[PDB]
Amino acid sequence: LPLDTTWHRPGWTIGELEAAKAGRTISVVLPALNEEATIESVIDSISPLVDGLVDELIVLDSGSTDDTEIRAIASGARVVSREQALPEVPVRPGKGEALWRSLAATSGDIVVFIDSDLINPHPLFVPWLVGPLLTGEGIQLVKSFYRGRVTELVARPLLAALRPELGCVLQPLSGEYAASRELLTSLPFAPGYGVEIGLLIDTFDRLGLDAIAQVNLGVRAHRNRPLDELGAMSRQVIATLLSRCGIPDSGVGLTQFLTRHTWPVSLVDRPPMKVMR
Amino acid sequence: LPLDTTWHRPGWTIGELEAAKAGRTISVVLPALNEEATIESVIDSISPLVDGLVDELIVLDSGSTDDTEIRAIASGARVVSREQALPEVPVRPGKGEALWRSLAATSGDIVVFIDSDLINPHPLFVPWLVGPLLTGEGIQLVKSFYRGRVTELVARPLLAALRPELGCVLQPLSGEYAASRELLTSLPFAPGYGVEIGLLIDTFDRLGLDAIAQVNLGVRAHRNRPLDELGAMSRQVIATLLSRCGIPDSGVGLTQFLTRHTWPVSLVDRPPMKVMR
């Protein structure tokens, strides 16, 4: 593949990777909205790395109203609200907002994102993801893949239509990935569920494929959302993808008939966090 | 809805509808590719209308290699191959080809399409669909709806993005619909699975919503295809939708990793069947 792809279990040990840091730091961010059932398992999969390979782990709590925050705290995680991450700026809804704000609440040269709704995640996710950033050259972004309705019906076919160079990316919508701060604070952040696809297209347009790697995380399980919520997610993915391709989006939310309901869509990106410096 | 929508069971009787024909004829087309398990049930749901409300029923056999044709014949249906429908023109693959060719093998002023993979279809499908064409004014196209992964994730959200006026169409991808010959032979036909969405957008752009109605057919069951085949279907739907919206499509087929496989996509429409006159 024209895309650096690690097809089998990476061979790097935790101690090698740590040596390879060479003064660089690593932050881990778990965005979370109402994931009380899974958040503790995810934090626990990663907290053993802290003060070693990982210099920092935070939960970016994105407005949870369940026990996400208390359970995360009881697992020893630093929990940061959207408001605390960036208090001069009023909070908008959606995942992209949470991730963008997380840049202001972390200081790692490398930032790793892991969804907090994962079912029994491997403790090597973070080592496997930072590998190419640490030991490669010019890699600034690493995507995960795994053995994807929105992914297989919406994002990959749309990429084939409009950015076929990215056809080799197996899981463009993957919530597990790592990237340099220099890259992330230089890119705008799409709102809502548009954030991954925006980052991928923006990264590629700006640095080309050679700046991107992907690593196999094996098998993945997570919360299965209802079709209607996916419809809304897909709508936002489309809105962001069309925008990156110079195509005007109507700005009209998807409507569904159960009576009538209109879901929000946003055509507004957050600017590169750099301007907030 | 700005779209003429019949929300409950239509009240027209078969005898009223027949009276309303007023010299107009009605053709029914069942496109079929390897539907031996369901084809007989579908034909039988409709053949009682023949020589009455329905003047003509054909199965457009689209290259079947199972018992579709023999079973359809044994149910008393006229079976027409792609080659027989239009023998001067070599056959291309896909559904859109079959439907376009079916225009050459029928002569009804009204043409009704019904998928041949339906599980126990109602015998009133055809009466319910021709209703607005017979008793309305200016209606040239009638779509069905029902209580849709490609539909809900790809087509409706893309329509919301690019032709939001069509947001009120509940089942844009529905295989059950009827339209005037005058309309159908005036429109190009998208290849493969692009044919429905192309017809809807072309119809709207040319006649506006007032020329379109939709009728509730209740509940629908059909063959559930694997995700990868849907991926390919979605790719073609996207290709056709982008084209109708003036957006250049790469022409690159969707690739999937199981090793690598590329599915065909086509950017070539068939012209209005009128030019073949």
Ligand SMILES: O=c1ccn([C@@H]2O[C@H](COP(=O)(O)OP(=O)(O)O[C@H]3O[C@H](CO)[C@@H](O)[C@H](O)[C@H]3O)[C@@H](O)[C@H]2O)c(=O)[nH]1
């Ligand atoms: O407003 C939100 C919505 C989600 N999340 C968190 O983000 C993660 C992913 O959200 P989820 O609802 O599980 O998304 P998915 O349906 O799995 O969507 C997939 O595809 C999306 C589009 O790229 C990605 O954003 C997701 O990370 C990816 O898992 C979860 O941990 C959530 O807790 C927030 O923090 N705030």
Ligand SMILES: O=c1ccn([C@@H]2O[C@H](COP(=O)(O)OP(=O)(O)O[C@H]3O[C@H](CO)[C@@H](O)[C@H](O)[C@H]3O)[C@@H](O)[C@H]2O)c(=O)[nH]1
């Ligand atoms: O090359 C082909 C492919 C399909 N068919 C027939 O067309 C009908 C619909 O095909 P199907 O594979 O069942 O499509 P769906 O997955 O159900 O796709 C839905 O969405 C598509 C995109 O609009 C429509 O074309 C379909 O009619 C609609 O049911 C079936 O009776 C097939 O026998 C052909 O005749 N030739």
Ligand SMILES: O=P(O)(O)OC[C@H](O)CO
């Ligand atoms: O929830 P699924 O089964 O529709 O697939 C979700 C993938 O992990 C992300 O698109």
Ligand SMILES: O=P(O)(O)OC[C@H](O)CO
């Ligand atoms: O086969 P489904 O369940 O994915 O839905 C199919 C609809 O009838 C057409 O998009």
Ligand SMILES: [Mn+2]
């Ligand atoms: Mn999830």
Ligand SMILES: [Mn+2]
């Ligand atoms: Mn079907």
